[PDB]
Design a protein around this ligand. Structure first.
Ligand SMILES: CC(=O)SCCNC(=O)CCNC(=O)[C@H](O)C(C)(C)COP(=O)(O)OP(=O)(O)OC[C@H]1O[C@@H](n2cnc3c(N)ncnc32)[C@H](O)[C@@H]1OP(=O)(O)O
Ligand SMILES: CC(=O)SCCNC(=O)CCNC(=O)[C@H](O)C(C)(C)COP(=O)(O)OP(=O)(O)OC[C@H]1O[C@@H](n2cnc3c(N)ncnc32)[C@H](O)[C@@H]1OP(=O)(O)O
Ligand SMILES: CC(=O)SCCNC(=O)CCNC(=O)[C@H](O)C(C)(C)COP(=O)(O)OP(=O)(O)OC[C@H]1O[C@@H](n2cnc3c(N)ncnc32)[C@H](O)[C@@H]1OP(=O)(O)O
Ligand SMILES: CC(=O)SCCNC(=O)CCNC(=O)[C@H](O)C(C)(C)COP(=O)(O)OP(=O)(O)OC[C@H]1O[C@@H](n2cnc3c(N)ncnc32)[C@H](O)[C@@H]1OP(=O)(O)O
Lengths: 405, 406, 406, 403
């Protein structure tokens, strides 16, 4: 006998998290679970319980994500989606998805996002891969910059997490409106993102924080990294580098690249068009491995298309097919540009037909709509409409992965 | 040691010319490659330095034609065989050969020069910029199932000899490449080199095989070039090229390569960063994607080159271009372009964007975002909102792809 | 930003000092190592830069004593804990600390300084020269049989506790080191650090073990320090040190480690390049030998340092010494040395050899040939026959060995 | 199964002789190597056992000349092609061939024999001792910058054909080897084998290349032999120069060559000058192993032909187990400009075997270390110390070309 319910208490939450970690073949990291509890809404963490333990889980964090154009809209941060192997292939995931996607529409969140882990799972529920990330690595001795890179007058300082947290949120909130895909970070989220977890210490070492100051003393850049000593070939596992100006960005990177005793650097979760890739004088010296990052499930399709902005003017009619939620299917007229966006049901002839997962794949501008059509996954009903739609759905800045959840 | 800059005089000089190039690349001269590539080599375009006994520096270019964003096929100098012997390095020989070649490219009416960079950092100083990237796709074939909505069609496939392949694939190639910017036209001589069963590639894997995809009526609509590498069942497939005239033939041919019974891993080097195969696969992470440099672009005639291509969106921008190596190109260009029009003029109006010719070449094929180059500090915005609109126009819904090797 | 150069003020300042040093080395502060090394740390010899809140640069030296060729034990500055925080690097902080330290070393009557470089190329500019090498010996224990004429004696071996080891090994150590130039005297505090069962070394292998070799009459004549690394039977023995007062105890102790069941590979880092074990083995290639830097020498008082050691053969040579970092030491010195006498004085006679102070330090311990340095172009011979005779005199029949780590 | 000890009879016998040697080494006969090495092969010096159908054991020696400490070039038996077929091993065939060869070496007036040990423990019983070591130098070329005071000179380098290389390198080689003990004289026939573009080495790397360094006046002053392996590797065979500037310039040429990431130099000296030119000493990995074993056949002559780094007057009690006729007491009087060794009746200062005496003969092994190890016995205090210094040399011995 299985029961769908929410978390009743933190004792039930610690058992809720223990079962989820158990599905991932991991001992529950008590430090990570404790810090993430500070922003865990127990009414949003659902799952199945057989009266003796949890056998399935599915959660969602109330977060806010930057869209193309600078809008910060509410988004469901889907997390902790597990089914115990003794109850798999029985429909438990299908039920939780239907309950969560209805709950997401309740709270006004126009879409949902989550990290794929295995991408082929959520495509049936309407999720589409919309963001890719690149793992950048290589020898720091080969990563000299182009001779025209301006490092500026800035200064850098190894500092504690709190002086970091006293300036980094100001630096973060200033640059993310221009970085679609990034999510806002409350004080409770910065605590988890800067957490010195024991598990990451096993892989490299304790966390360290750098701040970049301009000549007048203003903080303008930060860095999160972990050193892995080795023999001399130590490794720098970079977690995040950001700057309010190109000089603070290049100065912070050149600081990490010039660190004595270091030979190899690693930056996982970076953008596929990270500024560092184009600063290096020799591109092949910085290996770039691209993979999935964020999947998108449009819950309010007309509001989602009207919440973002488009790189160029577009007037296209889309015949959307939501196989998972047939009430969302329809035919909308999208009238969008750099400064306007409207999406309403229309009875006019359709220009393009595609599923809701394909509409979500191209939503953040990370996947080309034209490529999906030439591949046979999207159908052009009127000539020329796909090419102009693929350009408008694009964006000069590629989407990037937010902090982990 | 008196050096003379000159072109190839005859085939005996041509073979010695190639011998030094292979020697600088630390390779024995491949006689099969050198002999078949001669058929399209213009001796007067192969320059270099000769000390009276042997070639000590080389630099050449093939007269080819590349597809631009918009479908235009324009002449391009396919730069190749750029070497300086290590005994004569750091003496200015490359800088001289670059000056003579780039001037010669302009004299022949070629608006641009393209190049496969072995070492990317070499040519940035000469005005070259990385404009196209390529991805090495690989993974376990048993994890590369397609999405359930992928239509494979009713076509049939035959593995056939190179000659029958060459009697049908060139027609297929010419039909699809107008929509694939970066691809180059392939004459019979270039098809002969591209399909050459070279011994060096046989060493890494095996003899070349050729596949043709036929529609239900017998019309050839797709092809594939690959080499097997047996191992123990632990065999690999090194895919050289896959193309089709419709989505069904493309997917059907890939499914053919993936369902080979003794194969476990497959590899496709030189694929597009937006190769359709990546989106056909049901589990994206099962197809590893490593991205690296492909083609560097050197704009030789900026006004003509910018007017020959089409732009994804309307743009009216003034570009302050600085060309340090070729200062005759430094100046301000007004670009007014769209999906069906393009015009470029040297102007004195106020500039909207400041950038070097190498960065302008980087964004020319729509493979590098002009906005990212500006956010990185390499490009300077002079008037608000200009870079955003220019970046979108310089883009293209189809990413540029790498042509056949040269 | 304001920096202040000062020494450690108290014990709480000592912890912060060592914490910054470990941080620059990208390591967590090892409290077991920091606690045991404090016992011989002189706070007035530990300098560094402080920005008012934390140490941003460190540089220290232990007052130690080193054996010279001939058996003389002279004071030496054991340089240690040289760090500059990455936020303050390449700004001259080390250069200043070097000037302060080298001047401070001279005041203490120390004629020379010694050093293990993390990166050797650092200290050449300050007058340091590589003078001693060490060899990492390793191989399969079942291939390391000894020559048939090697006498193992009638001794007995016992595995003992650290307390029993420290009550008998120092007497054995003190007896052998007069004939091993480069080895340093070990106080009880240094034995405590040298035998520390540090947690970091337990991770790489296992807990430290101690072995004592007893003669037939019960006299302890040899010892061994090693750590096991279990693995499957394919375990490793990581030998830290083996010593004996006679060839039988030396060979018997090694034979004990080599005959240990369940062991397959053995490793001995920091051995001498002329370690006796290398010549005991019947099949020399079975004992792999990798040679690398050990100790760098910085001569602070040239006349005294050259007069404190003995020379393998008679020499009467005039040396034109150039000291770029400390130009006050530059000058011309006449060296008169032999097996039982040594003198060095400023002279005005014609010079026989021209060399820098770093190269003079390189040959000072008899580990680097002055003839090779001259044939290499680093040292200039002014009068024929001088370098050959001087090179032999600066040598020694026993190669210098690396002391315990600092 | 009747075995006959005999020498090579003709050229057809030479092919079968060499083929059996390669077979024991589990290798197909390399015809390019066999053909070029015939030009300096003396058939009467190639002995072995033949069972009436095939060679079942081999042992040979090349008549060469080796540089000793002090610059003297003396004749030496370069022992080679020592094999015993696995169907006839452990029956004394090698021991018999050793007695015949060493007796033949004594009859030819050669005071010593030298040999490259495949397995070192084999020949110690016959009086051979490891006397010279070689170092394999390797590392990343981008980490091998030189010290700032290294003068590269104004010379120029050219890649040349084997023929052009062979018209200038031998003169450079002959000029420098008097100061490099262990190096052997190279006739044109030996240069042909040393520079042979053998097929076996082409598979491991590539075709052989040759470099010449010319002074400002056009005088060739250095050379280099290397093979490329396309993160490409350079396998350096030999680099030499007549002055420090040409030596460093040639190495700088190999280290700055484009597309190269790692370089390897097998058979280098343990005190190779390159090791001290590098600004970052640890960047040049150094692995040391056995090179040449020495078998002293005429102790008084061999010890008197070399020079000693310092004056010495020592009496050595030498034990020669395999050849007991050489056992006896020798007084050595040597220095930088004199050397004599004679049977004496004075009290002995040091006791050692002939194999250990051969080990220290080239100055590559310390007599003090052998004594401290228990292999050599000191009879009078202070004798080993002075003898060890004299038996040393300011230039470490180096390995000659392969044989
Ligand atoms: N993220 C994670 O995967 C965390 C760990 N999760 C798990 O271990 C679980 O097994 C889950 C969440 C992957 C699957 O949960 P289940 O309860 O087994 O899902 P459910 O039974 O509702 O059906 C899921 C559907 O998607 C498909 N699917 C789900 N997960 C996977 C997967 N990992 N690989 C392939 N197909 C999958 C199934 O084929 C099924 O369709 P079908 O069964 O009609 O053919
Ligand atoms: N293609 C190949 O890789 C062939 C192998 N070529 C080489 O080794 C040569 O060194 C070349 C062709 C790379 C350079 O040719 P050179 O004759 O040295 O050209 P030139 O003498 O005119 O100067 C080359 C310039 O480009 C730079 N450069 C050229 N090639 C490289 C390279 N591979 N890596 C880094 N910098 C390079 C040089 O530093 C120099 O710039 P500088 O003025 O700042 O020093
Ligand atoms: C204690 C021991 O046993 S050795 C421990 C020291 N080794 C370490 O790696 C400790 C970590 N500390 C560092 O790396 C420091 O940054 C150090 C050692 C490089 C010195 O700090 P700095 O303040 O930057 O040195 P300073 O500026 O005073 O002068 C250094 C000079 O030598 C050069 N140099 C110093 N260390 C190095 C090095 N590791 N690699 C290359 N060049 C170096 C500098 O470039 C400069 O020479 P220049 O005039 O040509 O530029
Ligand atoms: C470049 C050169 O010329 S060196 C190349 C020679 N090395 C080779 O491995 C070549 C291939 N040939 C062989 O291996 C032969 O079998 C050899 C070298 C072992 C000698 O052949 P054999 O006829 O068996 O030699 P022989 O019978 O005279 O043995 C004499 C002693 O040496 C010992 N011995 C010789 N070689 C070895 C060895 N590789 N391992 C162990 N013991 C050995 C024998 O056990 C025997 O010991 P003993 O006196 O206590 O009985």
């Amino acid at each position: 006998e299985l029961t769908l319910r929410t978390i009743a208490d933190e004792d039930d939450y610690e058992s809720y998290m223990a079962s989820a970690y158990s599905v991932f073949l991991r001992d529950p990291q008590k430090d990570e679970i404790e810090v993430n509890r500070k922003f865990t809404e127990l009414d949003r963490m659902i799952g199945f319980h057989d009266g003796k333990k949890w056998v399935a889980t599915t959660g969602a964090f109330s977060r806010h994500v930057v869209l193309p154009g600078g809008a910060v809209v509410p988004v469901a941060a889907v997390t902790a989606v597990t089914v115990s192997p003794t109850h798999r292939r029985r429909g438990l995931l299908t039920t939780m998805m239907r309950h969560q996607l209805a709950d997401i529409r309740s709270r006004g969140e126009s879409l949902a996002m989550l990290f794929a882990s295995e991408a082929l799972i959520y495509g049936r529920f309407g999720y589409g891969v919309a963001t890719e990330s690149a793992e950048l690595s290589g020898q720091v001795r080969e990563l000299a910059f182009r001779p025209t890179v301006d490092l500026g007058d800035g200064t850098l300082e190894e500092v504690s997490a709190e002086t970091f947290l006293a300036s980094a949120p100001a630096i973060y909130d200033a640059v993310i409106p221009g970085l679609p895909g990034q999510m806002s970070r409350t004080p409770e989220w910065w605590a988890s993102w800067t957490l010195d977890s024991e598990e990451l210490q096993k892989e490299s070492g304790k966390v360290r924080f750098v701040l970049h100051y301009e000549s007048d003393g203003t903080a303008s850049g930060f860095a999160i990294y972990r050193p892995k000593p080795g023999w001399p070939n130590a490794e720098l596992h970079v977690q995040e580098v950001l700057g309010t100006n190109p000089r603070s960005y290049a100065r912070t990177w050149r600081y990490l690249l010039d660190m004595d005793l270091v030979r190899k650097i690693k930056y996982h979760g970076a953008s596929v068009q990270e500024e560092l890739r184009y600063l290096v004088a020799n591109h092949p010296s910085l290996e770039c491995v691209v993979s999935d990052a964020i999947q998108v499930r449009l819950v309010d399709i007309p509001r989602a298309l009207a919440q973002r902005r488009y790189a160029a003017d577009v007037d296209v009619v889309l015949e959307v097919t939501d196989d998972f939620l047939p009430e969302n299917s329809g035919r909308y007229r999208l009238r969008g540009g750099l400064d306007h966006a409207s999406c309403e049901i229309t009875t006019d002839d359709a220009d393009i037909a595609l599923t809701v997962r394909d509409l979500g794949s191209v939503y953040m501008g990370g996947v080309s709509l034209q490529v999906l059509a030439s591949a046979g996954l999207v159908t052009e009903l009127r000539a020329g409409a796909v090419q102009r739609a693929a350009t408008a759905f694009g964006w000069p800045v590629a989407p990037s992965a937010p902090d982990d959840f």
